[PDB]
């Protein structure tokens, strides 16, 4: 549910949209993640490994 479960009732939301919002938070537009999704996922998995 992203961060919405802290304020009030939890609200379901697809994960890629959540990551798009979180890039939009730091000043990077949404037209970056929707292209580089595969690379981002690979990097995340490598780091968490």
């Amino acid at each position: 549910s992203g961060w919405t479960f802290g304020a009030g009732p939890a609200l379901q939301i697809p994960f890629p949209m959540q990551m798009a919002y979180r890039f939009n938070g730091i000043g990077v537009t949404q037209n970056v993640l929707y292209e580089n999704q595969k690379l981002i996922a690979n990097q995340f998995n490598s780091a968490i490994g």
Binding site: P16, M17, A20, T29, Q30, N31, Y34, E35
Partner: protein
């Protein structure tokens, strides 16, 4: 996540796309206020075959009917 009308992807400027079952609207995140998907609250970038989960729909144009009716 995106709408492709003329083979081009359209992303919201600030908000999220929502479909009630028949049409498609763009709404703000923390409150329900649907609006017609024009070309003023969305921006275009990239082709139609790079994003995942895109859908097919047309985007309203405010200038085209107004100026085609008048130019006649």
């Amino acid at each position: 996540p995106a709408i492709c009308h003329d083979g081009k992807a359209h992303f919201p400027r600030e908000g999220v796309f929502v479909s009630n079952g028949t049409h498609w609207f763009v709404t703000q995140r923390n409150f329900y206020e649907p609006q017609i998907i024009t070309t003023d609250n969305t921006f275009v970038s990239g082709n139609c075959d790079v994003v995942i989960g895109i859908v097919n729909n047309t985007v309203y144009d405010p200038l085209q009917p107004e100026l085609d009716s008048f130019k006649e």
